[PDB]
Write a protein that binds this DNA or RNA. Structure first.
Lengths: 65, 65
DNA sequence: GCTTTGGGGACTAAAGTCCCTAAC
DNA sequence: AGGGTTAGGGACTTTAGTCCCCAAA
């Protein structure tokens, strides 16, 4: 449960990622632009030591359980 | 645990997918080409009623636990 | 005069889709 | 030997991702 380091919405970029959504879908759910999302997510992977959104999801998926 | 329908290696295309690997990484671990894997995976998502490999992975991740 | 917090530019690269061949 | 698996090319269209810099609050 190492969610220490993730901003407000970065922990909520993990739950949307873990529902195998697309940047643009996750975008609408948050009122951003897809470009904005691409950024936040790509930062978040860096913060996580991962290089693919899929790893983030599975990792998130493991926390939720 | 609905792995009924999945061929031999389709159940193993779900364990590799669930490690957030890439078609080409997955393809090395299976001795295929990346093109070959693009196809297998894409079929497998159809068989699963999903349209994005991330979904597959999370779903797979939920079975493993 | 700064921190958050949102997004364009500008691509490089993965992912996916569909349909159609060969090799056992 | 005309058939099912099992593997991949063609040929793109879409999402993802990367970095770095730019304004509003």
């Amino acid at each position: 449960d190492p969610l220490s380091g993730l901003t407000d919405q970065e922990r909520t970029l993990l739950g949307l990622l873990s529902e195998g959504l697309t940047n643009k879908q996750i975008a609408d759910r948050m009122f951003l632009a897809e470009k904005t999302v691409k950024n936040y997510v790509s930062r978040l992977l860096a913060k996580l030591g991962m290089e693919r959104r899929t790893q983030a999801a599975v990792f998130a998926t493991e926390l939720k359980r």
